[PDB]
Amino acid sequence: NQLELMLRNATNDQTFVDYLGAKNALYSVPAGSTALTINIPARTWEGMRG
Amino acid sequence: NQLELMLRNATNDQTFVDYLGAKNALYSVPAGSTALTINIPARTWEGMRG
Amino acid sequence: MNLLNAAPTPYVWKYNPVTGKCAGAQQNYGATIDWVLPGGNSFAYAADEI
């Protein structure tokens, strides 16, 4: 019960992040083609990892 | 040395352009064919000459 | 809470580096919190305060 009271308090609540940490996108590349271009619109990139 | 020093100054340094000013792409057209489609990825065309 | 009094998302600008002129502004969707479907009343206030 004390754990609940000290865990229901807002400043200390569970925070989880996906381990992959990657938006996953699949871009089609036809069989014979050798080149691919990935153009995506304006975005704030606020904290990109790579 | 005066000439080389007024050319080392960054406000006045050499600038050279290719006279052709044209990206060169060769699109195959077989013998019997009479038509060709040139599709290109999304781009900004920021100063295109034609 | 009332969403009419909720603080809006900021407008971030687009620079357009090549021409140098401003390319406009956009609703800053690139950094937004998902708070109405998973969050509810506890996180609506948090998102507004953020």
From TrEMBL, chains A, B:
Domain of life: Viruses
Induction: Expressed in the late phase of the viral replicative cycle.
Compartments (UniProt record): Virion; Host nucleus
Oligomer status and interactors: Homotrimer.
Function, in words: Major capsid protein that self-associates to form 240 hexon trimers, each in the shape of a hexagon, building most of the pseudo T=25 capsid. Assembled into trimeric units with the help of the chaperone shutoff protein. Transported by pre-protein VI to the nucleus where it associates with other structural proteins to form an empty capsid. Might be involved, through its interaction with host dyneins, in the intracellular microtubule-dependent transport of incoming viral capsid to the nucleus.
Similarity remark: Belongs to the adenoviridae hexon protein family.
Name of the molecule in the record: Hexon protein
Full protein stretch here: 593 to 642 of 937
UniProtKB/TrEMBL annotation, chain C:
Localization per Swiss-Prot or TrEMBL: Virion
Coiled coil: none
Protein name, UniProt field: Hexon-linking protein-N
Full-length numbering of the shown residues: 1 to 50 of 247
